[PDB]
Structure formats: C-alpha cells, structure tokens
Design a binder for these strands. Structure first.
Ligand code: K
Ligand code: K
Ligand code: K
Ligand code: K
Ligand code: K
Ligand code: K
Ligand code: MG
Ligand code: MG
Ligand code: MG
Ligand code: MG
Ligand code: MG
Ligand code: MG
Ligand code: MG
Ligand code: MG
Ligand code: MG
Ligand code: MG
Ligand code: MG
Ligand code: MG
Ligand code: MG
Ligand code: MG
Ligand code: MG
Ligand code: MG
Ligand code: MG
Ligand code: MG
Ligand code: MG
Lengths: 132, 66, 343, 205, 184
RNA sequence: GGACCUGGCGGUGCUUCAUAUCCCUCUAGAGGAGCCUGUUCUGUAAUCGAUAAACCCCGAUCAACCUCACCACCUCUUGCUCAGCCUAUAUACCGCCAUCUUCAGCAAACCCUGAUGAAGGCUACAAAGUAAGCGCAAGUACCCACGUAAAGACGUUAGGUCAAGGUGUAGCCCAUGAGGUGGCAAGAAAUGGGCUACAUUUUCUACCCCAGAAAACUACGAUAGCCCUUAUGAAACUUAAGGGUCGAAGGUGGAUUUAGC
C-alpha cells in the first residue's frame, strides 16, 4: 500500500486541510505547488540551491512563528525578490507579529542576500477541508 | 428513457436500482395502452432525446490551381 | 545537522509507537509506557538561555512612554528565571499528579457497582438528570474472525433508575469500553420499567420466580430492614427506590438472567388496590406494633362483595423448605445473619 | 484494444456494395441502413480489394513470418509460387499431348489442393474423466483442420533434415508432393487418423 | 417435520418461478438452503410430466412408437429453457430420427403442458442427446470418411486472564469572551 | 463434563467459474552450450541487508582508490558538532513499501431480532434495517469516451528496511568513537536471471529490400582466453573501447517451466 503524503482514514474526527487531504498523484491536478521558481524548467540552472533554500525557510518559519502557522508556506520568487506567504492564527498579539515580520524579513534578507518580504494572512482557526 | 441519476434529480430523492426499473416498467406499460394527449405529455417528461452524431464523411472543398 | 531535524509531531509519533503490530493486536503491553508531553506548553516566544530582552516580543515595547532598547538579564537575574521555570514545570507535573480518586465498586478491580452518571441529553432537548446509572457487568468477549483471528470486544450490562420506581437495564457492545458504556446507559432509559413499591420502601408481596436457571426469592420486609440481597440486586434496588427487602439467589448466578429475572418479577407484582379490585373485598393490614387495630390499606372502587371469602381450613400453597427450616430453627448457617455495613 | 467495442470490422468487398437494391431482402436492407450509423475500424494494411488477393496464402505467409519480417515472409511465398509454376511448365513441355491435359500449371490451385490433402479430419485431444487425461479422438473444427495443414507444412520445411536447401525450393517440393497425395506431411495426416482409430475405445473418456 | 428442515418462516409465500421474476430478483440476495429444494422439486415434476407424456399413445403416435427414455431433466434457474436430456440409443441413425421427432414434438409439447395449468408457466423445452453414445456418433461418422492412407516453549498466557489497568486509571483519577477592536 | 457459537481444517459435497488463464489449444522463450551477472556453498585476516509466493542485474539509475559500513597495522582523545556510535532491538517505532489487489469491501453513529445468551439483521408482487465517511466508481494524465498509466480502502504476513534519515529502550565513551596506510572480494561446486549462439527466413559486402559471393575442420559460432594500442584517472595484468591472434563448447536442448489478447 502507498503511504507517501497520505492522511489515512480514521474515525471521522481528524480535521485535514485541503493540502493534507490530497495525495501526491493529485499534485498539478487538484492541488498546486507550494513553491514557484524557474529552477525546474528546462534549460534553467540552480535548482539544487533553490531547493535547499526552500527547505530552510520552511523550518525557519515553523520555529520563528511557533504555534502560529495554520498551513504550509507558499514561496514565490520573482527576479531576486523572495515573497513568503503564510496563513497564521489570531492568537499572538499584533505587536508580536509585527516584531517577527520585521525580524524575519531582515534576517532572511541578509542570509540569502536578496530582498525578502513576508505576507501574513490571519484566520481564526485552521481551515478544515474534511474530517477523515 | 432518463437514467436513474436523472430521475433522482427530478424527484430530489435517492433511488434504488429496482426502484428505477419498477418505474420504467410502469411507463412502458403506459405506452402500449391507448394513451391520449394528456397521457403523452407526461411520458415525454421522462424521455430524454438522444442526439446522434452523423457518421457521414465530411467532403473536402474542390480547389483550383493556377 | 539542522536539515536532519523533524517536527515534534513526527518525533512523538515515532517515540510513542501507537501504530504498529504491537498496537494492532495489543501484542505489546504497557506497564511502562512512553507518555506524550507538550514541550511548547510553558515556552514563551522570545525567551532564550542568554536572557535577552527583546522590546515588543518578550518584554513591553514602550516603557515610561519611550521605546525600550535591547537589553540582557544579569547572570543572577537569569538563574532565577530558569529556576522559576523548572519549579513551574514540577508544579504543573504536580497538578497532573493530583487527580481526584473515584469511589470503587463491589471490589477494587471490579466495574460492578460503579456509577456512570446520568444518561446523555437526547437530541430534542431531552434530559435525564434525575436518573442514575450503575454498571452490573463488564465482560471481554473474544470473537474468532476469518482473517483477523481473535479480536477483543466489550459487552457491558448497565442499569438505570431515578429512585422513584422508574428503572431499566440495557446491554452495550463496542470495541471500546467507554463506547459500550454510552450505548447501554442511553439505551436503558428507553426501556424503563415502572416498579410498584409498598409505601415507597419495599415490595408489595413475596416474589419467588425462576428465569431460565436463575431462581430469585424476594421477601417483603418492614422499614429499617435494609437491603439484604445479592450485591447486584442491592444496586438495582437503589435505582428503583426499594429500601427494605430480603432476596436469595440460587441456581445459576448469571448477571443478565438475574437482572432481567429481577425486573420481570418486580414488574408483575400485584398491588393492594389491584387485589381489592380483583376480589371486591377490603384489604386489611394487621401490624403487631399496632396491636389488633385493623388498617384498611385498599378498598375496591367498584361494589363491595357481601359473601365472605371462603375459609379453606388448610391452604394448598407450596412452601419453601428453606423458609420452613428457618421458622423452626432447624436452619443453622454460619454465614446467615452476619453483621454487615449499612446497605 | 484501442478500438471501443462500438467499432465494427470493415467489410472489404466491392461486389457486396455494387449489388442492386432490388435484389436485397428486408433483412439485408436493415443491415445496410444500420452500418451507416456504426463506427468502422480502419482497414488493416494486410488485406485490400485487389482481385489477386488470397486470404489463405496471406495466412500461410503470416505463419511463416519470423519476428515481424513480413517482407521476407512475403518474398519466400512469391518465390515458392514461382518455383511451383516453373516446375509445372517444365513437366508440361516435356509431356505428351495426352498427359498435358492432366498437368496443372496454376500455383494457386496447387497450393489450395495441397493443403486440403493435408487437413486432418479428426484429432487427439485429452478429455479428462476419472482423474486422468486420455487422448480422446475428437472431431476437429474447420478452423483447426486448416490451421494444422499449414503448421505441418511449415514445420516440415523448417526441419533440419533439409541441408542447405532454400525455403522456396523445399516448400515448392512439399506442395507438389502433397498435391499428389504424397509426402511426409500427408503421412502425418494419415498417422494422426490411424492413431485416432486405435483410440476409438477411449472415446468414452 | 423431518430431519430435513421444513420450518420456513415464509412458508406460505407463493413460489413464483418465472423468467420475469429473475430480472426483478435481487442478485444480492443469497439463495437459501431450501430455495434449492423448491427448484429441485419443480425439476422432478417436469421430469414426471414429460416422462408421462412420452409413454401415452395419443399425444403423438410418432412419439409413442419411439419409446423415448429421458435420462435427466434440469430446468435452468434462469428460467429461459427447460433442459430435457434424452438417453441416446446405440444405433447411429436412430439417434438422428429420435432427435428430429423430438424437436418437432417439442413445440406442441409446450402447449400441452399448459393443459396441466399448475405447470403452465413452462419455458421453451430443449432436448439434449446424451453424449455418452452421441459424442461417439459424430466421431465414427468422420472416422469412416477419414482417409487413413494406403494401409500397410515460551509460556503463552490465556487471553481471558490478561490483566488491564483501565479501571485502575479510571478509579485512580477523574481525568483532567468579549471581543473588541483595538484592545489595550 | 453437557449443549451451542465462531474460527481453523477436511485424502469435504454440489454448483458456476478463471480469458494470457487452472488444464488443453496459439506464439516466442527458459531448462542443454559458452559468456555476462546475482545468490548459495566453499575459501579468505577481511562487511551488512534481501533471501517461498512477495529474495536472487534485490538496497546499487552501479565497489580499481574514494565510495566503505569490512580486515591487518599505526595514531588521536571535550574529539567536523553545546561530542560521537552503520552498536543491539524492524518483535518499540516514524518515514517509505512489498503482498493478496489480475480484490470490493471496511465502517462510525443508530435501529431491530434472539426471553436483552455467545450471536443475527435478506427476499422488489420485498419479510428490519438506515447509514456519514473511506475504497471501488467518477474525474484527471497520455493520442478519444478506447487502452495504458495512475489510483487501489480496512485487514492479512509481529512481511521489508534502526545500514536513507530520524527516533524509543538498552549498551560503548582511551572506544563498540575518530583518522591514516595497505589489503579482501577467489572458485571444487551448485543454482537464478540475462546475453550470444547453434545457422540457409542463414553469413559477408554494397544497398537500405529487383545485387554479388560465402556456405562444414580456412563454414556458422565467444561480448571468452592471450598479446598490443587507445580512453578516463594521480594510480588500470584489472575498468571500458578498438585491433591482432585464437576458432572452443554448441548441431535447437528430458522431467519441468516463463511471458504475451
Ligand atoms: K466450520
Ligand atoms: K533453452
Ligand atoms: K514499518
Ligand atoms: K533508521
Ligand atoms: K535506534
Ligand atoms: K539462463
Ligand atoms: Mg504498488
Ligand atoms: Mg485492591
Ligand atoms: Mg543454461
Ligand atoms: Mg551477501
Ligand atoms: Mg540475513
Ligand atoms: Mg531481516
Ligand atoms: Mg517470504
Ligand atoms: Mg582505504
Ligand atoms: Mg575499497
Ligand atoms: Mg563503526
Ligand atoms: Mg515488521
Ligand atoms: Mg478511461
Ligand atoms: Mg499500476
Ligand atoms: Mg479509480
Ligand atoms: Mg519480522
Ligand atoms: Mg573503532
Ligand atoms: Mg575478443
Ligand atoms: Mg594514461
Ligand atoms: Mg570462422
């Protein structure tokens, strides 16, 4: 039986998001990609470097906004700009979100030597697609 | 005849397969009778026209050279 | 390596080992079990070992109307913070260690006799706060299955009652013991019997019946006698509202046969008014504490017969040798009439 | 198959279409109006409307084809037909006016009659009764008889007994032998029948 | 009843073996053990009915003279046709004559079964020659025609005694708004 | 010990089936020969894992050093790391999978029957079942609506993997950790898979299908052996390519067995 990225049936009490509810074979059919860049296009270079950067940013944001992320990050690259789009919860005070936005944008801009912007969308609770 | 999934929408209910057959067997039993105009508009509500594509080959235009 | 690290959920799912051939068939038993702990629980965003004070994250942004600057706690001031967090961790552990202990049942490891509370409120704003639920039997049933071998399910017997004559029982079956508890108690309140009680404390007459192989003999008793009955009958009688009764259970001591045999016998007891109506005579109670005073307990609603009830010089009623052996004093048992706790 | 079940096989027969309407029956009229609504498979590259088309030779050619080499299989077939015809023209010119009348020079007539002389009427197939397989002499369907006459002819020519003889010379020699009720392939037919007669008592299995 | 069980709850239900019922029957339904008995008994009646018709002179003088004997009769559970196996005679030519007479008679036989209305709803009757002698007939017909050529101990605990602490965990411990803009 | 239920099993009955499918039928193979490669066994100072179906050109879309985890010898000790460990346990696990599946079922929550026993719950001219969800299906990808992919639940085999990585428990910490040099990986033998053949529907050349020669001890046939050269590399009797020399077994392969609509 296939296991990869499959939330398995339970008793009907497990809330899953739209992304979590779709196995890998639905990628590009029902669900899109969580990162968009040019490294994986034919004739394009530096796919290895874009991949390492993406793995880091997901870990960095998970631990930088602990308990706040309500969904996976959407990473967008245009030119040398890096845009990080995150769906977050509404538990932390707005002051702490502004601190972490200023802190994270600056630290990541100096780490990867590119202008980095972080876009936060707040939701009252994790958006549930279905109960598996 | 309309399919079970189309009957299940006219009625807005869930139907069994044998429920569908019983309804069709009862409509066929109505056509064989001397059904009038009032009994003919009713049966056509459950008849869906089948649009058949023509297998006739398309003819290319006849052109002329210099 | 930073990139080889995983999230807490992945780490606990692995460490706990709740999914696996060990947990499929309970092939592994857990006297020592890894217990999940939330390690982000008491953690404050911005607080680290170095003790830096970040304005707007872990300390207030403005102080005295001016924006605070980056600062660091002194070595001494930081030890106190660390010590305070360790104590808060043991205090939290102490709060979880302090769990209110619930009363036991017929025995320390028995489920029988334990209250489950009132049945759940029905969908249409129905409530059963007046009813109490008691467990009578919790059994592990083992089913041999075509592909999965021996599987373990739970059969539970529970009784419900409001203490004012309305009581019932239901069987519950589920893979989990707490789902069975829900099914039985909720189902029991839809199969309630009404039990007639003499003066709201005892039965109307002696009841002797057999259900399958379980024999139950019940005796009407005066106030203050208490419930001197099989422990399950005691539990059921408290739900019904019977305070004074003697019962003797012989033959097969099957909890289910005993429960439904008991409810069958208590539901078919003729009251004094029913006896008066059936025979069109007065029902007169003679009490030795009241001497020869005749106390009419029930009178027929319809006309009153004029012909006395025939006085058979000798009744052809069947007697219990146990009752006769006792009345004569020939019944000697070291276990009868023993001192017991109030029931 | 890449054809949905709705696709019908093509009917490649010029005469079937030029037939006048009046000659048609009410059943044949229905089949013709029906096919106008049906999906038709593309005609295979093997068969055409050519007047020289022979389905039996086309089948024999495919049973000789090794590894999809139709060009070579077809070349061997036409070389066999040319070799048969030349052997008969040599037998014809060397014969007397009386014998000439009995000498066949058409290789297609020889090819068909040679195979028909090798078709086995009855075969041995193991029908099971009582927990054991008994080679019961069973009738052979028409398809099986024609197929066996071809497989036996092709097998005999591929036998290693022939040393350095090219296939068009071997096959032509076997066809003319079988055309005269002589040869190894004819013996295989006779022996199969004789074996089926010795197992007549086993027809109950 | 007998050791053979006949307590069917739906005993009074009217047995309706018709081709139409099969199309409205639930294939999901699983046949009862006694459902076969109703089919088996009907097949016995069809055997007795055909067998008796065969031996009476009047129904068909051609049929009576043949002295046909039926080996077996099994109606299809589909109800499309009533299989009627007829024992094959050793005489090769006589197996064709008997078969030909049966096929012609079969059409009239179906109407004559409606005379016995209880068996009225009979499917088209089909006669099958017993291959025991018939299969050999085909071979011997080809055999003569054919050309044969010019002749010449880890302790396992009891599952019921397995100890559990679910109660000990239960008895040990009872298990453990205004929203405004710009809040300060 | 009695009765009954379930499961397992039956040298257990009947019935209908399998569509490249259990048997026969159809085509090309394996089983015999050489070679290539895996495994076993033996051997070696000298890894490990897989290993009936469901291992055996398998982890490897790949080992001359490196890789490397092995062996021998030498060396280091807060050590690339707020150490390290390819040490034990896949019968503690996550992760990713095999398998039936070339399946169609699993199932919460309710309801009813059996006296409220373990248990059971279907009949369409219907007799107690209703069922969210999951799977199938649908949809999508590829050239269609076909086909092929993909998908394929729950459960089965404590199936595979602690040596992808991570990690529970236990163990090592001047060693079970780290580094350096050199070295191992052979074949009495057996066996799996594959390649090349045994030739004439062939071999060589031209050509890419109207040709000329070859055709049994100078034929067909080694991608083997031996010798030389070249390529890659710091390093090549070793790896690969090419040339020369050599011209062997093999003459179409028993029981048995594989794949294909
Ligand atoms: K059994
Ligand atoms: K072979
Ligand atoms: K696993
Ligand atoms: K591991
Ligand atoms: K470990
Ligand atoms: K081989
Ligand atoms: Mg798979
Ligand atoms: Mg105790
Ligand atoms: Mg071999
Ligand atoms: Mg090995
Ligand atoms: Mg091993
Ligand atoms: Mg292993
Ligand atoms: Mg295995
Ligand atoms: Mg080395
Ligand atoms: Mg090495
Ligand atoms: Mg080591
Ligand atoms: Mg395992
Ligand atoms: Mg499709
Ligand atoms: Mg697939
Ligand atoms: Mg699908
Ligand atoms: Mg294992
Ligand atoms: Mg070491
Ligand atoms: Mg060579
Ligand atoms: Mg060099
Ligand atoms: Mg040579």
């Amino acid at each position: 039986k296939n296991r990869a990225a499959r939330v398995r049936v339970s008793k009907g009490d497990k809330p899953v998001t739209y992304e979590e509810a779709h196995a890998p074979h639905y990628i590009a059919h029902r669900k899109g990609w969580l990162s968009l860049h040019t490294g994986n296009l034919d004739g394009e270079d530096h796919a290895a470097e874009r991949t390492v950067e993406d793995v880091f940013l997901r870990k960095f944001m998970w631990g930088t906004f602990p308990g706040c992320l309500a969904d996976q990050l959407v990473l967008k690259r245009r030119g040398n700009q890096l845009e990080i789009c995150a769906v977050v919860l509404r538990q932390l005070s707005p002051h702490k979100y502004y601190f972490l936005v200023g802190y994270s944008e600056t630290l990541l801009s100096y780490f990867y030597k590119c202008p980095v912007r972080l876009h936060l969308q707040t939701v009252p609770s994790k958006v549930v697609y279905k109960y598996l | 005849w309309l399919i079970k999934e189309e009957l299940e929408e006219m009625l807005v209910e869930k139907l069994s397969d044998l429920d569908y057959m019983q309804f069709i067997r009862l409509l066929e039993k109505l056509l064989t009778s001397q059904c009038g105009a009032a009994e003919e508009e009713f049966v056509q509500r459950f008849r869906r026209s089948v649009t058949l594509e023509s297998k006739k080959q398309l003819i290319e235009p006849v052109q002329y050279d210099e | 390596s930073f990139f080889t690290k995983l999230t807490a959920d992945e780490l606990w799912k692995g460490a706990l080992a709740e999914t696996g051939a060990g947990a499929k068939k309970g092939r592994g038993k857990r006297t020592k079990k890894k217990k999940r702990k939330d390690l982000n629980r008491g953690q404050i965003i911005g607080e680290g070992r170095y003790g830096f004070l970040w304005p707007g994250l872990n300390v207030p942004l403005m102080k005295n109307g001016a924006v605070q600057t980056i600062a660091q706690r002194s070595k001494e001031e930081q030890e106190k913070v660390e010590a305070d967090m360790i104590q808060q961790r043991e205090e939290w552990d102490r709060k979880k260690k302090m769990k209110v202990k619930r009363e036991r049942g017929w025995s320390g490891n028995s489920w029988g006799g334990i209250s489950l509370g009132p049945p759940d409120p029905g969908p249409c704003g129905e409530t059963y706060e007046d009813f109490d639920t008691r467990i009578l039997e919790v059994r592990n049933v083992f089913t041999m299955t075509a592909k999965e071998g021996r599987k373990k399910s739970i059969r539970v017997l529970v009784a419900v009652g409001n203490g004012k004559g309305a009581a019932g029982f239901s069987i519950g079956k589920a893979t989990d013991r707490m789902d069975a508890f829900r099914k039985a108690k909720n189902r029991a309140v839809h199969h309630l019997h009404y039990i007639e009680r003499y003066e709201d404390h005892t039965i109307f007459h002696d009841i002797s019946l057999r259900f399958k192989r379980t024999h139950i003999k019940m005796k009407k008793q005066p106030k203050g006698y208490g419930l001197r009955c099989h422990r399950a009958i005691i539990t059921i009688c408290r739900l019904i509202g019977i305070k004074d009764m003697y019962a003797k259970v012989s033959g097969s001591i099957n909890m289910l046969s005993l429960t439904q045999g008991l409810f069958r016998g208590l539901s078919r007891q003729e009251t004094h008014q029913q006896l008066a109506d059936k025979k069109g005579l007065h029902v007169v109670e003679i009490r030795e504490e009241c001497g020869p005073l005749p106390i009419v307990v029930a009178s027929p609603r319809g006309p009153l017969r004029k012909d006395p009830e025939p006085e058979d010089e000798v009744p052809d009623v069947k007697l219990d040798w146990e009752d006769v052996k006792t009345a004569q004093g020939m019944k000697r048992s070291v276990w009868s009439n023993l001192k017991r706790a109030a029931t | 198959s890449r054809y949905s079940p709705e696709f019908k096989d093509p009917l490649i027969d010029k005469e079937y279409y030029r037939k006048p309407v009046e000659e048609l029956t009410e059943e044949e009229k229905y089949v013709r109006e029906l096919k106008k609504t049906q999906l038709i498979k593309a005609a295979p590259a093997g068969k055409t409307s050519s007047v020289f088309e022979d389905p039996v030779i086309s089948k024999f050619t495919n049973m000789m084809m090794i590894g999809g080499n139709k060009v070579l299989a077809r070349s061997l077939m036409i070389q066999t037909l040319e070799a048969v015809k030349r052997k008969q023209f040599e037998k014809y010119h060397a014969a007397s006016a009386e014998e000439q009348a009995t000498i066949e020079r058409n290789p297609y007539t020889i090819f068909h009659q040679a195979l028909k002389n090798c078709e086995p009427m009855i075969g041995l197939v193991p029908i099971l009764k009582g927990g054991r397989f008994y080679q019961v002499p069973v009738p052979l369907p028409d398809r099986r008889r024609r197929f066996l006459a071809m497989k036996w002819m092709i097998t005999e020519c591929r036998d290693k007994k022939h040393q350095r003889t090219l296939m068009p010379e071997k096959l032509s020699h076997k066809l003319l032998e079988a055309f005269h009720n002589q040869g190894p392939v004819i013996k295989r037919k006779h022996d199969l029948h004789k074996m089926a007669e010795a197992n007549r008592a086993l027809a109950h299995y | 009843k007998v050791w053979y069980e006949s307590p069917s709850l739906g005993s009074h239900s009217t047995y309706k073996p018709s081709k139409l019922e099969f199309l409205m029957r639930s294939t999901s339904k699983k046949t009862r053990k006694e459902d076969h008995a109703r089919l088996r008994a009907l097949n016995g009646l069809l055997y007795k009915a055909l067998t008796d018709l065969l031996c009476t002179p009047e129904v068909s003088q051609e049929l009576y003279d043949l002295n046909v004997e039926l080996s077996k009769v099994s109606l299809t559970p589909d109800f499309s046709a009533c299989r009627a196996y007829w024992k094959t005679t050793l005489s090769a030519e006589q197996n064709a004559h008997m078969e030909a007479v049966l096929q012609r008679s079969a059409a009239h036989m179906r109407h004559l079964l409606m005379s016995q209305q209880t068996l009225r709803n009979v499917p088209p009757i089909v006669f099958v020659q017993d291959k025991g002698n018939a299969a050999l007939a085909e071979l011997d017909q080809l055999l003569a025609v054919a050309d044969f050529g010019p002749r010449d101990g880890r302790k396992r605990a009891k599952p019921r005694l397995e100890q559990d602490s679910s109660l000990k965990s239960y008895l040990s411990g009872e298990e453990v708004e205004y929203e405004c803009y710009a809040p300060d």
